[PDB]
Design a protein around this motif. Structure first.
Motif, PDB file in Angstrom:
ATOM      1  N   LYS A 163       1.048  -1.721  -0.250  1.00  0.00           N
ATOM      2  CA  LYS A 163       0.446   0.115   0.379  1.00  0.00           C
ATOM      3  C   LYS A 163       0.834   1.538  -0.010  1.00  0.00           C
ATOM      4  O   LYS A 163       1.849   1.053   0.568  1.00  0.00           O
ATOM      5  N   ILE A 164       0.635   2.795  -0.568  1.00  0.00           N
ATOM      6  CA  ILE A 164       1.750   3.487  -0.961  1.00  0.00           C
ATOM      7  C   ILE A 164       1.218   4.376   0.295  1.00  0.00           C
ATOM      8  O   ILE A 164       2.819   5.022   0.794  1.00  0.00           O
ATOM      9  N   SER A 165       0.244   4.139   1.534  1.00  0.00           N
ATOM     10  CA  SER A 165       0.431   4.854   2.585  1.00  0.00           C
ATOM     11  C   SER A 165       1.396   3.660   3.542  1.00  0.00           C
ATOM     12  O   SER A 165       2.023   4.783   3.440  1.00  0.00           O
ATOM     13  N   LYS A 166       1.206   2.576   3.320  1.00  0.00           N
ATOM     14  CA  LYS A 166       2.866   2.100   4.213  1.00  0.00           C
ATOM     15  C   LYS A 166       4.085   2.253   3.666  1.00  0.00           C
ATOM     16  O   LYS A 166       5.051   2.397   3.783  1.00  0.00           O
ATOM     17  N   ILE A 167       4.014   2.550   1.919  1.00  0.00           N
ATOM     18  CA  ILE A 167       5.002   2.379   1.818  1.00  0.00           C
ATOM     19  C   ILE A 167       6.306   4.418   2.056  1.00  0.00           C
ATOM     20  O   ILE A 167       7.078   4.388   2.442  1.00  0.00           O
ATOM     21  N   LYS A 168       4.786   5.203   2.627  1.00  0.00           N
ATOM     22  CA  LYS A 168       4.931   6.613   2.294  1.00  0.00           C
ATOM     23  C   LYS A 168       5.663   6.596   4.296  1.00  0.00           C
ATOM     24  O   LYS A 168       6.792   7.226   4.863  1.00  0.00           O
ATOM     25  N   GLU A 169       5.469   5.595   4.809  1.00  0.00           N
ATOM     26  CA  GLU A 169       6.206   5.338   6.236  1.00  0.00           C
ATOM     27  C   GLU A 169       7.561   4.212   6.190  1.00  0.00           C
ATOM     28  O   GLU A 169       8.373   4.225   7.715  1.00  0.00           O
ATOM     29  N   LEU A 170       8.314   3.717   5.113  1.00  0.00           N
ATOM     30  CA  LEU A 170       9.633   3.576   5.018  1.00  0.00           C
ATOM     31  C   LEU A 170      10.670   4.462   5.477  1.00  0.00           C
ATOM     32  O   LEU A 170       9.936   5.800   4.922  1.00  0.00           O
ATOM     33  N   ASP A 171      11.845   3.270   5.505  1.00  0.00           N
ATOM     34  CA  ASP A 171      12.679   4.922   5.916  1.00  0.00           C
ATOM     35  C   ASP A 171      13.115   5.584   4.268  1.00  0.00           C
ATOM     36  O   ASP A 171      13.252   5.148   3.529  1.00  0.00           O
ATOM     37  N   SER A 172      14.355   7.039   4.007  1.00  0.00           N
ATOM     38  CA  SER A 172      14.669   7.952   3.094  1.00  0.00           C
ATOM     39  C   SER A 172      15.746   6.158   2.144  1.00  0.00           C
ATOM     40  O   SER A 172      16.517   5.930   3.325  1.00  0.00           O
ATOM     41  N   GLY A 173      15.332   6.001   1.182  1.00  0.00           N
ATOM     42  CA  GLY A 173      16.473   5.451   0.614  1.00  0.00           C
ATOM     43  C   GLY A 173      15.935   4.269  -0.023  1.00  0.00           C
ATOM     44  O   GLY A 173      16.745   3.533  -0.341  1.00  0.00           O
ATOM     45  N   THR A 174      14.851   3.528   0.676  1.00  0.00           N
ATOM     46  CA  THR A 174      14.632   3.091   0.555  1.00  0.00           C
ATOM     47  C   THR A 174      13.994   2.314  -0.810  1.00  0.00           C
ATOM     48  O   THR A 174      13.286   3.069  -1.284  1.00  0.00           O
ATOM     49  N   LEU A 175      15.124   1.376  -1.420  1.00  0.00           N
ATOM     50  CA  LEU A 175      13.966   0.172  -3.048  1.00  0.00           C
ATOM     51  C   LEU A 175      12.890   0.080  -3.009  1.00  0.00           C
ATOM     52  O   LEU A 175      12.379  -1.082  -2.106  1.00  0.00           O
ATOM     53  N   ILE A 176      11.935   0.465  -3.806  1.00  0.00           N
ATOM     54  CA  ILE A 176      10.325   0.380  -4.090  1.00  0.00           C
ATOM     55  C   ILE A 176      10.231  -0.966  -5.524  1.00  0.00           C
ATOM     56  O   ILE A 176      10.271   0.347  -6.733  1.00  0.00           O
ATOM     57  N   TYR A 177       9.777  -1.492  -4.886  1.00  0.00           N
ATOM     58  CA  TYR A 177       9.290  -2.118  -6.533  1.00  0.00           C
ATOM     59  C   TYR A 177       7.951  -2.709  -6.245  1.00  0.00           C
ATOM     60  O   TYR A 177       6.829  -2.006  -4.971  1.00  0.00           O
ATOM     61  N   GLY A 178       7.060  -2.242  -7.248  1.00  0.00           N
ATOM     62  CA  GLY A 178       5.753  -2.643  -7.146  1.00  0.00           C
ATOM     63  C   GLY A 178       4.676  -2.230  -8.531  1.00  0.00           C
ATOM     64  O   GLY A 178       5.372  -1.639 -10.204  1.00  0.00           O
ATOM     65  N   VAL A 179       3.861  -2.831  -9.020  1.00  0.00           N
ATOM     66  CA  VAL A 179       3.067  -2.383  -9.828  1.00  0.00           C
ATOM     67  C   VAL A 179       1.231  -1.111  -9.314  1.00  0.00           C
ATOM     68  O   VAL A 179       1.001  -1.719  -8.162  1.00  0.00           O
ATOM     69  N   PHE A 180       1.000  -0.202  -9.768  1.00  0.00           N
ATOM     70  CA  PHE A 180       0.152   0.412  -8.776  1.00  0.00           C
ATOM     71  C   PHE A 180      -0.427   1.920 -10.465  1.00  0.00           C
ATOM     72  O   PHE A 180      -0.103   1.433 -11.767  1.00  0.00           O
ATOM     73  N   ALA A 181      -1.875   1.685 -10.017  1.00  0.00           N
ATOM     74  CA  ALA A 181      -2.397   2.494 -11.560  1.00  0.00           C
ATOM     75  C   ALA A 181      -1.892   3.765 -11.482  1.00  0.00           C
ATOM     76  O   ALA A 181      -1.979   4.098 -10.358  1.00  0.00           O
ATOM     77  N   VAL A 182      -2.562   4.117 -12.236  1.00  0.00           N
ATOM     78  CA  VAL A 182      -1.749   5.762 -12.998  1.00  0.00           C
ATOM     79  C   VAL A 182      -3.286   6.751 -12.712  1.00  0.00           C
ATOM     80  O   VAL A 182      -4.413   6.724 -13.662  1.00  0.00           O
ATOM     81  N   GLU A 183      -2.527   7.617 -12.103  1.00  0.00           N
ATOM     82  CA  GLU A 183      -3.383   8.867 -12.522  1.00  0.00           C
ATOM     83  C   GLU A 183      -3.155  10.005 -13.546  1.00  0.00           C
ATOM     84  O   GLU A 183      -4.189  10.408 -14.184  1.00  0.00           O
ATOM     85  N   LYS A 184      -1.770  10.104 -13.323  1.00  0.00           N
ATOM     86  CA  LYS A 184      -0.979  11.269 -13.723  1.00  0.00           C
ATOM     87  C   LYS A 184      -0.086  10.614 -14.795  1.00  0.00           C
ATOM     88  O   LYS A 184       0.541  10.347 -14.028  1.00  0.00           O
ATOM     89  N   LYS A 185       0.335  11.311 -15.607  1.00  0.00           N
ATOM     90  CA  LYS A 185       1.853  11.470 -16.545  1.00  0.00           C
ATOM     91  C   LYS A 185       1.785  12.118 -17.031  1.00  0.00           C
ATOM     92  O   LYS A 185       1.336  13.080 -17.923  1.00  0.00           O
ATOM     93  N   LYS A 186       2.970  12.707 -17.224  1.00  0.00           N
ATOM     94  CA  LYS A 186       3.647  14.160 -18.000  1.00  0.00           C
ATOM     95  C   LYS A 186       4.877  13.600 -18.577  1.00  0.00           C
ATOM     96  O   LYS A 186       6.015  13.360 -17.397  1.00  0.00           O
ATOM     97  N   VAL A 187       4.840  13.995 -19.137  1.00  0.00           N
ATOM     98  CA  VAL A 187       6.047  13.901 -20.071  1.00  0.00           C
ATOM     99  C   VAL A 187       6.361  15.150 -19.935  1.00  0.00           C
ATOM    100  O   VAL A 187       6.378  16.232 -20.729  1.00  0.00           O
ATOM    101  N   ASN A 188       8.094  15.744 -19.744  1.00  0.00           N
ATOM    102  CA  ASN A 188       9.045  16.621 -19.273  1.00  0.00           C
ATOM    103  C   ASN A 188      10.199  16.554 -20.070  1.00  0.00           C
ATOM    104  O   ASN A 188      10.375  15.292 -21.082  1.00  0.00           O
TER     105      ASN A 188
END
Ligand code: NA
Length: 198
Positions: free
Chosen positions: A112-137
């Motif tokens: 869960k994204i809310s759980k991801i946010k509680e991890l330590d900075s620098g933690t490597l994250i893997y997963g499959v997520f729905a996309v709300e927005k995408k922006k190519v810069n």
DNA sequence: GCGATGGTTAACCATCGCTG
DNA sequence: GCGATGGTTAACCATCGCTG
């Protein structure tokens, strides 16, 4: 060198470990076109592991559901890293085992994204997520990803836009870095990050 | 000493979007 | 209209690996 391409602070494991291959990505270039690698997930009877593989000779060995025995690999905060230093053999029958269903399940689940946010900075994250927005810069591609309960910004900083992603796709992330500090947490690319449509 | 890597803060400027 | 949001760049601080 024995540590070529290996992450800072990684620990060498000389003893053989037998794993069952669950998944592996195609190879891709990183480090501004200078090196290649692929991601993989493997499992033992007790754990699953994310794996970064730098030796392209091993791509043929990382086949779904096959058992392989690895030695002289490195361990980087729980991520297995494998370069030319390692030995990889096909596993002997008397070295095989049943991977518990709960391990297979865990290896495939996304936190869960809310759980991801509680991890330590620098933690490597893997997963499959729905996309709300995408922006190519010019210099990045950013995403707002979400699950049923929360959302988070994804920052892809690599100067390269050749991502296999189409509108409507869920986004699969490999080895993104959790960043926090004063302000909103985000997932930011690092030298090994890989992103694709599911 | 330098390159690779990388998290945090912040300045600066543009664009978005619409009452806690 | 105007405050919130977002992209780009940079400075800062930090560690490691190689320096046979
Ligand atoms: Na490589």
């Amino acid at each position: 060198t024995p540590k070529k391409n290996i992450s800072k602070g990684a620990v060498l494991h000389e003893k053989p470990m037998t794993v069952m291959v669950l998944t592996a990505t195609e190879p891709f270039n990183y480090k501004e076109g200078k090196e290649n690698m692929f991601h993989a997930t493997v499992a033992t009877e007790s754990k699953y592991y994310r794996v970064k593989v730098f030796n392209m000779d091993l791509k043929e060995k990382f086949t779904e559901n096959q058992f392989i025995t690895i030695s002289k690999y490195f361990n980087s905060s729980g991520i297995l890293e494998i370069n030319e230093t390692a030995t990889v053999s096909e596993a002997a029958p008397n070295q095989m085992f049943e991977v518990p269903k709960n391990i297979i399940r865990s290896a495939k689940e996304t936190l869960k994204i809310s759980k991801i946010k509680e991890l330590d900075s620098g933690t490597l994250i893997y997963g499959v997520f729905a996309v709300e927005k995408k922006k190519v810069n010019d210099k990045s591609i950013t995403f707002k990803i979400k699950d049923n309960e929360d959302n988070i910004k994804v920052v892809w900083d690599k100067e390269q836009h050749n991502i296999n992603y189409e509108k409507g796709d869920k986004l699969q992330l490999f080895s993104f870095h959790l960043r926090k500090g004063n302000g909103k947490p985000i997932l930011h690319s690092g030298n090994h990050s890989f992103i694709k449509g599911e």
